[PDB]
Amino acid sequence: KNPSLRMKWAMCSNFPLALTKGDMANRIPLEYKGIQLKTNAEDIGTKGQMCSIAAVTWWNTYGPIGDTEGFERVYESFFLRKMRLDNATWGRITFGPTSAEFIEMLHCLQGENWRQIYHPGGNKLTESRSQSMIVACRKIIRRSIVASNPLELAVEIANKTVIDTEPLKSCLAAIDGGDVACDIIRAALGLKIRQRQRFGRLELKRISGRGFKNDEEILIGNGTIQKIGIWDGEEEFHVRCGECRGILKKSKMKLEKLLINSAKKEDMRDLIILCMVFSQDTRMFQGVRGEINFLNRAGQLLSPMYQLQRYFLNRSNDLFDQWGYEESPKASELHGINESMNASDYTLKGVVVTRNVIDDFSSTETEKVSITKNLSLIKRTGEVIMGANDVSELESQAQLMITYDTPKMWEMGTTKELVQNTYQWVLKNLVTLKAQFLLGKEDMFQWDAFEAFESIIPQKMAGQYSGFARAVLKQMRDQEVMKTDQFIKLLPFCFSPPKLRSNGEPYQFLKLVLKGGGENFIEVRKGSPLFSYNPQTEVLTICGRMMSLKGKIEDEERNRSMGNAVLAGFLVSGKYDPDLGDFKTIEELEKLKPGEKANILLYQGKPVKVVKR
Amino acid sequence: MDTFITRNFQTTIIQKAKNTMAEFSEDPELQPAMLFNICVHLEVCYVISDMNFLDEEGKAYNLRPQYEVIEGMPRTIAWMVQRSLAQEHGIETPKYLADLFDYKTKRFIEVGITKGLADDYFWKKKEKLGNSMELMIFSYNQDYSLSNESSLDEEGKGRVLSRLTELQAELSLKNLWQVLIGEEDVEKGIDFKLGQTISRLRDISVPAGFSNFEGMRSYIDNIDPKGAIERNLARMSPLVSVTPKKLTWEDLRPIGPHIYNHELPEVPYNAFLLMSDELGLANMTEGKSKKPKTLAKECLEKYSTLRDQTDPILIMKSEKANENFLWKLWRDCVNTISNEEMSNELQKTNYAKWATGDGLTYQKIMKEVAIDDETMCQEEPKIPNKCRVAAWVQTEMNLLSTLTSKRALDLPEIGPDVAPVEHVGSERRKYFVNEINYCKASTVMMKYVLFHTSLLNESNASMGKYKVIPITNRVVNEKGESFDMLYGLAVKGQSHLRGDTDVVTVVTFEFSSTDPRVDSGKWPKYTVFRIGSLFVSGREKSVYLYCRVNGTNKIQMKWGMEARRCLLQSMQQMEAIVEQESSIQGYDMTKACFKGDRVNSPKTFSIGTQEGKLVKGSFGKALRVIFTKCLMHYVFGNAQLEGFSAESRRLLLLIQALKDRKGPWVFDLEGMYSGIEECISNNPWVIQSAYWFNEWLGFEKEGSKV
Amino acid sequence: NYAKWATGDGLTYQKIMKEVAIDDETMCQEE
Amino acid sequence: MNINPYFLFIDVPIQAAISTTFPYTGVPPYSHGTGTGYTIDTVIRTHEYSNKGKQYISDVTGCTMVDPTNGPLPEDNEPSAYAQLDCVLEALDRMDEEHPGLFQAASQNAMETLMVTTVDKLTQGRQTFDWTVCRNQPAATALNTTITSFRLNDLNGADKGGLIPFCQDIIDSLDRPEMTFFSVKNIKKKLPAKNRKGFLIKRIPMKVKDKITKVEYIKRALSLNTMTKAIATAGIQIRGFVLVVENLAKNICENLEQSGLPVGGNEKKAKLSNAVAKMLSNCPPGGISMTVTGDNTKWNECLNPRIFLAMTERITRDSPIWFRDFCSIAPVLFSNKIARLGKGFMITSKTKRLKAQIPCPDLFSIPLERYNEETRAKLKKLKPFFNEEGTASLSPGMMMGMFNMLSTVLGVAALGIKNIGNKEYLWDGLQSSDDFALFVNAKDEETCMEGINDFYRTCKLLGINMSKKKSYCNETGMFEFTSMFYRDGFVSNFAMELPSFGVAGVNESADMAIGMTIIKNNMINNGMGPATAQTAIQLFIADYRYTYKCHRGDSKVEGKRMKIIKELWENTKGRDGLLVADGGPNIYNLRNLHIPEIVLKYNLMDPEYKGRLLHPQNPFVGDYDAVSGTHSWRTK
Amino acid sequence: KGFMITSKTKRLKAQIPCPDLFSIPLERYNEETR
Ligand SMILES: [Mg+2]
Ligand SMILES: [Mg+2]
Ligand SMILES: [Mg+2]
């Protein structure tokens, strides 16, 4: 009645697995490197041969390579599930108060107190160019937003980004499609874009009227005073959202007319809600009975209009409830839609669907806008047309490999790709890095690669790690000859300002841990699953991706002991003297008086002795 | 199967058949033959009803048809239509759900699809139903059986027979004629009879006032009970009432006041292992996993003075304990661990039999002898003692919630985050482990889990001898160093049985630096020797050995091993707090709660009192307190603690209603208090929880007035 | 089995090793 | 500073602060209410709440029977079993009025499911009493033993496959003058010992043809044994009929908006929210809506099988007589039930250091002065209902959860009255068998309390006993239902069965799928959060790697299989495609808990590794979704 | 042979040999033996 304990005991046995009979079953060696894989026992009557789990491992490592054609055909449902998951788009997760393709993700979509927006995908491949361009532009915008002077970072990252093989600038100049982020990047690079007013996903083109925004203090449903710029005067715009279009006539805090056509239900709802929020209707302002404190990924506070937009996009019912209703006329072309976007004469107050086709306003209008520091696009007249706030928050995986050749985007790695890039960059610039290091100059620590590296160092220990690395490097440079492998290993950590203890000395460490631990650590004196080196073969294995080190290494940095650059302020002396005591912990090394000796164990079989200076 | 069903039947028929079959079968897709039968039956029913029409007076041509289709619709509405027709037309309602209703003769119609032949299925349907409803039987092969002459004519018969023929041919030529199932097999079983014994048992299972079951059946089937409830409520005694009372703050009194009685003993420590007084002997390693015996051997080699102490300096003795037995058991355990053999078997098994008290077990005798023996009586139950609050529980809570220099948690990795919910969970986990990694409670929990794992592992074939199970752990400090910690040694007894509940004796000898005489009332269950002295950072600390003879079983071993779920419990509690915070807003509040955003300041909690003044702390301190509370709830768990935690919830919810100004009412407040207080006898956690609840209730009362 | 307890043959003290007897302070000679 | 955990309530709502107070939902290892004492206590309590009713002697088994139904109305607030048949019938009639065709639809659906059910279905339950051996055995074993012993008695209904013929044989075996069966005995047989005597006494489970009389068989069929690993188990003679009765009750329950037992997961919160919103919307303008979080005292001990027989009779009123007779059997058999009292007690001599277990048949064979006080009083009260075979008669009451659906139907029928005397209040609620939430809308709190009092009295009339010591009331918007706290939309859980530790124990290929599915279902149904689910994934991966010795290939762990895992790590280029059982990295997260890991890693697998792993001729292969491979091996 | 010591509550008995006559405290003997 204890399957877990029984299985644990069985796996500790010798030959617990039943093995069939045949040529393939006879291809397993009797024993591999001293490990008994299959029992050489002939059962009396059952004739049942046994094998160890090591036999399964041996088969997977060295067994015959059987044909693997048509495997995806047999398990087609599982591969379809994987494809649906991979091609899907993720929206936003909202807290507080169905197709079979959605029930699959029910665990990741619906919680007791939270809900995740999920758009399933699958075989949407044709327009991979534009999809990848949009994804790249959105990622660039997100990265540049959180940085001071977003425009400079965005322009310097967009120039170093390639979709498949074509530079992102070429994709932007050629495809001409995209979204708000694509337009922002296009204007950032100096290209031309179609001119349309943006409010979230709502594209507006004025066709009649005038407005003069005035600062006012408005009251909202939840009972708070907000400073809003309200628009006065009768204005008319052609509005669009995804696959839906319409005409909006509005006035001061009032929506007069809202004609629209039939389109996707979700697109209809988004267009209609955004039209209400743009109309600045007081009837809309009164529907706010929650808390509007929504922020952006930069951590700043959204402006009131976008606050209301986000609130009502999340909570649409709070508006359709406090929007009233009316009866649409029985004209054939004219219609009405209820809160669920159905065919019902009991329609929303001032909203009406129509049969006649509204000509799309997207006439070729390639112009040259001016982009501000904060990714705000402004006409020659001086009126903001779009900004970072209107960029969609949807996230998806690009259909074509995009690569950003710049350290600023290395943060989008897995903390192992980031380390890989950092150390490959260190190796490539090893000669110049060492030449600059051997000059008494420390600007090298400020390079953008180390910026990216610091994003995976625990903020709590980053200063101590940096102090330790800098002290070790200074010891390896000034008071003693350098070791190339240790210099490479400890150079990235030197960025953060030193956080030396009150004694003035650095913090001694045995390992340096990074984000997502377990195997993401750098051993200060021994090989690690993330950084290993062969002192003789001159091979630097970073994450198992061995790279050579010929030439860059030196003749004199081979006879030197590794124990000269393992603890700051300590220098090897004597040998493994077994009189001082056992291998001291770092705590006693830190507490040791200057001029004292100590014993260390570099690794399994390499004791050494050191002395404080 | 699905392909042929889709091709040969229109969508409406298929969906109607699926809906009809889903009502009584919970695995509709696992049996498509029933789907075939139902869709064919519905198609036939439509053929009979769709084309035949009628008119107002008698014209069998307006829009009135002469057939009403009761099939293919939900049974709830089908039964309404059937009963309505039967009542309106003055006819009896069949006990079965008919398929059609004929308006020319006003009769319910049952239609069947016979694979074999009609006039045989017809008589089976007659036996099942009888004279309740007319029958229309049509067979795959051309044949029919109708119970009326004015019923379906030849024109409908041709269409139905052709419809059957096409399906028959397709099944014949598509190898699916083997899947077909006749309707008879769905009607299997209507001849259920009651014997002579079951009928008589039924006759004597009727309520008072009935002679036999037939009278009860007729009474239920014929009597209108309207007005009975009010009739019985009018004549019910007024003393039967809820007696509601509007709860106030003055109605909430301290629970279990006897805990403040100083004439009672203070609760003694009774956990399996030392939690905050534990002392582990540390030996640096390279992280390589070692056998428990080898780990203990090396740890004892590093401390030879403690290992080689062969004389007992007795500091404290339990009332019924034998210090000689315990010291000899400890020496046997040490010698066994230090020997070069690979077995943890104790050398002196005969002595260990009596040193552990295993030899003092009563002797089972024949029930006859005991029956004649007038001196054999049932023992009185052991009433738990009534104890008062002990300061050591507060000290344990204070110490276990602090941060140490060692962490025992090293969890594996998971896939990268791609969804926003995954990022939310990852951030929450990051904060949780940052606040909990170096908590003392984490190491204590890991020690408990490892000890119980080792105890259970040694129950495969070693339940008949005496073993020594080291109490060990593996920890890592902020510098990356790895230490093996030996907290003591336990000798595991032996149960001749293997019943998963038989008690096995475990004698635990745990290192400590705590003088037992500083808090005498905490250690009446332990006999303590001073085994030596230790140097840690230039300070000499005395090292005592706490020895105690406890017991357990495989069930308790598994429970202690499962004690690691306190981590998940604390994670879920933190997630609930953060989700409550973010429900007020529309976005996740993890960073706002923990670090604090530009709009939201870092959330602070009330963590305790300092000289009667509330003290605030961060969310990390609150998390450590939550984890320690969960760990102590698990460690001290028993029937009393389970009852106290299940019962005080109602009082807590009443207090929440009072705070929210929801105007709570109660029906028996003293009953609630008695139910809560019956569990406060000797559990240290329950008594401390009562003390803490009284203090917090006083604070809530004082805050209610402001 | 019944005769064993009826005659009192089952109510006989069981011998133990002298080591535990020496260690046990409650084992005393009978007056 | 002295840390007070309760101070967390000063800053957090108590609903969120007491989330998952218990990390388990099963019975703890210490709160075991099992034994002869507990069974006797249950019998005494059950007969105490019905001792003012009729008392007679069964003419079939000869036991003493107590009938509380249609008895005198209670005069105090103690638990009452004196349900009135007329009140129950009126409640059910109003329930039928509110839901036209529901009783008939449920009856027809249950009847058809019965006509389609097969005898093999009586194997999916838990331990069941076996009369042939008079012991608790797994459902399949008991079913097979009963079928064989029936074949011995010329009762061949199980061979036909249908459940109705098997039940017909079950009820016809009650008429056999005597029943022969196969009993398993540990026969102390002869063996040539090595000793001088040469007689090594030893046992073996031999099957023998035993015979019992009609009355003994009837008592065995009506018997329910005490559990050790619900404190009672019923035999195979009752499961066949309880199945159909519970199916009918579930058919009724799933169509009632007040029923909330079938619901589980995110639709339970939806049910709570919908009930709260519906009650708030219907409150009179300027009125008050209150919610009572209720508990029922002695729910099982005060519900009578006679009332359930009346319920089944009323529900199946328009059904064919054969189905009505089939449905009446289960309550009929439970109204004549016999309780087996367990192993017995233990009496010891401290001076002689002796102990002996007195079995149940011999409880009264020694003077009651040799039992402790509580057991002596228990036996004094039990004597009238004690049969001289170690069993007691329990005619009134429902033992434990056996008719949960029907009890929920009765509770919802109580909630459907909605009013008494045309007073100025209206009540609704949610029922989950013995747990309930009541909502009362009125003009002021005084009329709300009047409505709550009326509901309490109506429940007393129906045999339901609300707990005054555990139920309470507060303004609507905050309450608890089936351990789920609701407050202003926010929802929490008091207890959650967090994942156990270990592996399923099938094989390394299926264990990963089983664990991932367990986590997925926990975060779907049990309300597990993202961080908790990810931590559960981490803990399961740790347990998996510990059990199957399949740590990462870049780790430093010694072992027979780890030695080859390291070589596989060195040889492989696409190490991200290796399975966890092959030392590869773990790539499971919340989004991909429903995809097999082989399918997940296929596009990253090396050609040679994927060929060897997915070798159709591999010698190892010879719910959850898994892909067959070298890791889908078997253990003897 | 030695002396026989006994425990009545535990119903145990043992034979302390002649060499170990003084191994136990003399208070555990009877007056005459002591
Ligand atoms: Mg029909
Ligand atoms: Mg319940
Ligand atoms: Mg409840």
DSSP string, D404-470: HHHHHHHHHHHHT---STT-SEEEEEEEETTEEEEEEEESSHHHHHHHHHHHHHHHHHHT--B-TTT
A399 is a domain residue: no
Note the Cα B579 to chain centre separation in Å. Answer: 23
Rounded-to-integer distance, Cα B384 and Cα A378, Å: 80
B580 is a domain residue: no
Rounded-to-integer distance, Cα D58 and Cα D64, Å: 6
Residue with tokens 């309930």: D436
* One domain, residues A284 and A303: yes
* One domain, residues B170 and B202: no
Residue B691: name the closest of B608, B605, B577, B606 by CA.
B608
Residue B111 counted as an annotated binding residue: yes
Resolution (A): 2.8
Q: Among residues 8-27 of chain E, which lie with CB inside 8 Å of chain C?
A: 9-17, 20, 23-25
B441-471 burial string, b = 16+ CB within 10 Å, else e?
A: bbbbbbbbbbbbbbbbbbbeebbebbbbbbb
Residue B340 counted as an annotated binding residue: no
* One domain, residues A279 and A413: no
Alpha helices in B420-565 (DSSP H): 420-436, 440-457, 554-562
Rounded-to-integer distance, Cα D218 and Cα A434, Å: 96
Rounded-to-integer distance, Cα B297 and Cα B291, Å: 10
B591 is a domain residue: no
Q: Solved how?
A: cryo-EM
Helices B619-635, B440-457: crossing angle, 10 deg rounding: 30
Q: What are phi and psi of D106, to 5 degrees?
A: -65, -40
Last residue of a domain, one of B547, B566, B585: B566
* Smallest CA–CA distance from C15 into chain E, residue: E13
* One domain, residues B367 and B480: yes
Q: From the CA of D258, how far away is ligand 2's center (Å)?
A: 14
Q: Strand A570-572's sheet: what is its strand order?
A: A570-572, A607-612, A597-601
Which H or E element spans position A12? none
Provide CB contacts within 8 A for D614, sequence distance 6+: A66, A68, A71, D598, D627, D629
* One domain, residues A185 and A202: no
Residue D114: name the closest of D221, D245, D288 by CA.
D245
Rounded-to-integer distance, Cα D589 and Cα B426, Å: 10
Residue D103: name the closest of D259, D392, D319 by CA.
D319
Residue with tokens 């007020």: B584
Stated length of chain B: 706
Residue with tokens 């699905």: B2
Question: Do B36 and B18 form a contact (C-beta atoms < 8 A)?
Answer: no
Note the Cα B291 to chain centre separation in Å. Answer: 35
C21·E14 Cβ contact <8 A: yes
Q: From the CA of B72, how far away is ligand 1's center (Å)?
A: 9
Last residue of a domain, one of B541, B566, B591: B566
* One domain, residues A439 and A560: yes
Residue B162: name the closest of B71, B34, B44, B50 by CA.
B44
**Cα distances (angstroms) measured from residue B198 to each of B204, D20, D222:** 10, 48, 11
Question: Do A79 and D599 form a contact (C-beta atoms < 8 A)?
Answer: yes
B36 is a domain residue: yes
Total number of domains constituting chain B: 4
Alpha helices in B385-460 (DSSP H): 391-400, 420-436, 440-457
Rounded-to-integer distance, Cα B602 and Cα B593, Å: 6
Provide CB contacts within 8 A for B181, sequence distance 6+: B33, B34, B36, B37
Q: Two tokens at D58?
A: 């069964």
What is the distance in angstroms between the Cα of E33 and the nearest Cα belonging to chain C?
A: 9
Rounded-to-integer distance, Cα D455 and Cα D413, Å: 12
* One domain, residues A448 and A483: yes
Radius of gyration of chain C (CA): 14
Total number of domains constituting chain A: 5
* One domain, residues A245 and A288: yes
- Residues of chain B with Cβ-Cβ distance to C10 below 8 Å are 363, 365
Provide CB contacts within 8 A for B149, sequence distance 6+: none
Q: What are phi and psi of D11, to 5 degrees?
A: -115, -15
Residue A153: name the closest of A188, A124, A103, A177 by CA.
A188
A571-582 burial string, b = 16+ CB within 10 Å, else e?
A: bbeeeeeeeeee
Domain that holds residue B498: 281-372+389-566
Q: Say what the alpha-carbon torsion angle B138, B143, B149, B154 is, to the nearest 10 degrees.
A: 90
Q: Among residues 1-20 of chain C, which lie with CB inside 8 Å of chain B?
A: 1-2, 5-6, 10, 16-17, 19-20
Question: Do B603 and B593 form a contact (C-beta atoms < 8 A)?
Answer: yes
Interface test with D, best of E8, E11, E12, E13 (most D CBs within 10 A): E11
Return the DSSP state at B92.
P
Rounded-to-integer distance, Cα A354 and Cα A342, Å: 13
A82 is a domain residue: no
Which subunits count as partners of chain C given 3+ CB pairs below 8 Å? B, E
**Cα distances (angstroms) measured from residue D80 to each of B230, D74, D298, D409, D432:** 18, 7, 9, 19, 20
* One domain, residues B47 and B135: yes
B656 is a domain residue: yes
Residue B68 counted as an annotated binding residue: no
Give, rounded to a whole angstrom, the gap between the first and last alpha carbons of chain B: 74
* One domain, residues B168 and B257: no
Query: Looking at this protein, which amino acid is placed at residue B647?
Result: E
What is the helix, strand, coil percentage profile of chain D, to 5?
Answer: 45, 15, 40
* One domain, residues A291 and A235: yes
Which residues lie across from B73 on neighbouring strands? none
DSSP track, D167-198: HHHHHHGGG-SEEEEEEEEE--B----SSSS-
Rounded-to-integer distance, Cα B242 and Cα D450, Å: 9
Provide CB contacts within 8 A for A397, sequence distance 6+: A86, A87, A135, B418
Give, rounded to a whole angstrom, the gap between the first and last alpha carbons of chain E: 17
Q: Which of D74, D335, D556 sits opposite B205 (nearest CB)?
A: D335
Provide CB contacts within 8 A for D120, sequence distance 6+: D161
Rounded-to-integer distance, Cα A195 and Cα A381, Å: 13
Q: Which of D115, D326, D530 sits opposite B188 (nearest CB)?
A: D115
* One domain, residues B14 and B125: yes
Question: Do D633 and A56 form a contact (C-beta atoms < 8 A)?
Answer: yes
Rounded-to-integer distance, Cα A181 and Cα A131, Å: 12
DSSP track, A434-477: HHHHTTT--GGGGSHHHHHHHTTS-HHHHHHHHHHHHHHHHIII
* One domain, residues A535 and A560: yes
Residue D326: name the closest of D307, D312, D310 by CA.
D312
Residue with tokens 């086709």: A357
B583·A295 Cβ contact <8 A: no
Residue D46, CB half-sphere, CA atoms under 13 Å: how many? 30
- Looking up residue B50, the CATH number of its domain turns out to be 3.40.91.90
* One domain, residues B312 and B412: yes
Query: Looking at this protein, which amino acid is placed at residue B464?
Result: G
Question: Do A609 and A575 form a contact (C-beta atoms < 8 A)?
Answer: yes
What is the distance in angstroms between the Cα of B372 and the nearest Cα belonging to chain C?
A: 10
B235 is a domain residue: no
* Smallest CA–CA distance from B355 into chain C, residue: C20
Residue with tokens 């209609």: A272
Rounded-to-integer distance, Cα B511 and Cα B439, Å: 20
Q: Which ligand number lies closest to the CA of residue B71?
A: 1
B624 is a domain residue: no
Strands B614-617 and D54-57: unpaired
Q: What are phi and psi of A326, to 5 degrees?
A: -150, 180
Strands B281-285 and B482-492: antiparallel
Strands B100-102 and B107-114: antiparallel
Rounded-to-integer distance, Cα B574 and Cα B588, Å: 13
Residue B333: name the closest of B302, B296, B359, B299 by CA.
B296
A480 is a domain residue: yes
Q: Two tokens at A6?
A: 């029984």
Rounded-to-integer distance, Cα A545 and Cα A396, Å: 29
Residue with tokens 């065995």: D220
Which H or E element spans position D45? helix D36-48
Rounded-to-integer distance, Cα A367 and Cα C26, Å: 106
* One domain, residues B359 and B413: yes
Query: Looking at this protein, which amino acid is placed at residue B497?
Result: L
What is the distance in angstroms between the Cα of B627 and the nearest Cα belonging to chain D?
A: 10
* One domain, residues B109 and B13: yes
Helix (H, G, I), strand (E, B), or coil: what is residue B533? strand
Return the DSSP state at A478.
I
A360 is a domain residue: no
**Cα distances (angstroms) measured from residue B666 to each of A466, B405, D156, D446, D483:** 63, 50, 59, 13, 20
A66·D501 Cβ contact <8 A: no
Question: Do D392 and D338 form a contact (C-beta atoms < 8 A)?
Answer: yes
Domain that holds residue A286: 198-354
* One domain, residues A338 and A369: no
Interface test with A, best of B562, B587, B588, B591 (most A CBs within 10 A): B587
Q: Two tokens at A528?
A: 């690690």
Rounded-to-integer distance, Cα B35 and Cα B2, Å: 10
B613 is a domain residue: no
Last residue of a domain, one of B526, B542, B566: B566
* One domain, residues A48 and A13: yes
Residue B327: name the closest of B307, B302, B354, B355 by CA.
B355
Secondary structure of A77-109 as H, E, C letters: HHHHHHHHHHHCEEEEEEECCCCHHHHCCHHHH
* One domain, residues A158 and A112: no
Rounded-to-integer distance, Cα B452 and Cα D125, Å: 32
Question: Do A609 and A583 form a contact (C-beta atoms < 8 A)?
Answer: no
Query: Looking at this protein, which amino acid is placed at residue B556?
Result: Q
Residue D98: name the closest of B76, B277, B569, B556 by CA.
B76
B600 is a domain residue: no
What is the distance in angstroms between the Cα of C1 and the nearest Cα belonging to chain B?
A: 8
Rounded-to-integer distance, Cα D584 and Cα D576, Å: 6
* One domain, residues A369 and A337: no
Rounded-to-integer distance, Cα A236 and Cα A230, Å: 16
Given CB atoms, is B321 within the 8 Å cutoff of chain A? no
Please write down the long-range contacts of A11-16, taking CB distance under 8 Å and 24 or more positions apart: A11/A53, A11/D547, A11/D548, A11/D549, A14/A39, A14/A50, A14/A52, A15/A39, A15/A50, A15/A51, A15/A52, A16/A50, A16/A52, A16/A53, A16/D635, A16/D636
Query: Looking at this protein, which amino acid is placed at residue B438?
Result: Y
Q: How many helices (H) and strands (E) does chain C have?
A: 2, 1
Rounded-to-integer distance, Cα A284 and Cα A273, Å: 10
Rounded-to-integer distance, Cα D269 and Cα D491, Å: 7
A398 is a domain residue: no
Q: Two tokens at D454?
A: 């009326």
* One domain, residues B552 and B433: yes
Rounded-to-integer distance, Cα B646 and Cα B641, Å: 8
What is the distance in angstroms between the Cα of D155 and the nearest Cα belonging to chain A?
A: 35
